[PDB]
Amino acid sequence: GPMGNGMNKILPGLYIGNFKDARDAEQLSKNKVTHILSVHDSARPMLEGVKYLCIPAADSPSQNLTRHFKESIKFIHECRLRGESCLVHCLAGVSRSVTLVIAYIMTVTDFGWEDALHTVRAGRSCANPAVGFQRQLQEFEKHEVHQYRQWLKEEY
């Protein structure tokens, strides 16, 4: 459906879900989620036992997510390098959270955005970034992802 069917594993230690999944104690415990990247309107830390990164991004054609790629990748990557599990979520788990995870996958592999989206969809079939985010991801692939891969090498 249009908000998925529960949070889904994308890679080891990396999950995508909707805002309800992100409050579901049964899902968080079963998937051992200890880090949540919340990317939606008025995102704030909610639960105990969880490290949050909150990005107040709207579902709007004007919303810039590229400027949040670096902070998001650092948060996800440092969680995963510690052997812990991160959930990235927005409202529906379809567009905003998916875009950040695509940028992560592109940075830790040699994938362009379309192969990164294929990877997300293998775990979360409803994934579908809005057209504005597709444009940002294509520009990222063309001009920036190579710089981000070098940054990842130098940092970690």
Author numbering: -1 to 154
Structure paper excerpt:
DUSP22 is a small phosphatase containing 184 residues, and the sequence contains a catalytic domain as well as an N-terminal myristoylation site. This enzyme is broadly expressed in different tissues and plays important roles in the regulation of signaling pathways, such as inactivating the T cell receptor (TCR) signaling pathway, activating the JNK signaling pathway, and regulating the phosphorylation of focal adhesion kinase (FAK). The phosphatase domain of DUSP22 consists of five twisted β-sheets and six α-helices, and the structural scaffold is similar to that of DUSP3 (VHR), while DUSP22 does not contain an N-terminal α-helix surrounded by the N-loop. In this region, the catalytic activity is facilitated by C88 in the P-loop and D57 in the D-loop, and the hydrogen bonding network is formed by D57 in the D-loop, S93 in the P-loop, and N128 in the N-loop.
Structural alignment among N128A, N128D, and WT_VO4 revealed that N128 participated in forming the conformation of the D-loop. In the N128A structure, one hydrogen bond was formed between the side chain of S93 and the backbone amide of A128. The interaction between D57 and N128 was broken, and no water-mediated hydrogen bonds connected them. The D-loop was shifted away in the N128A mutant, indicating that the hydrogen bond from S93 was not sufficient to stabilize the D-loop. The negative charge from D128 in the N128D mutant induced charge repulsion against D57, which resulted in unclear electron density in the conformation of the D-loop and slightly shifted the N-loop. These results clearly indicated that the N128-D57 interaction anchored the D-loop and stabilized the conformation of the active site. N128A and N128D increased the KM more than 30 times, but the kcat values were different. N128D decreased the kcat by 16 times, while the kcat of N128A only decreased 2.5 times. Disruption of the DPN–triloop interaction by N128A and N128D critically decrease the catalytic efficiency by 100–500 times because it induces conformation changes in the D-loop and perturbs the conformation of the P-loop. N128A does not form a barrier against D57, so D57 can interact with S93 due to D-loop dynamics and catalyze the substrate, while this interaction is not stable and induces a high KM.
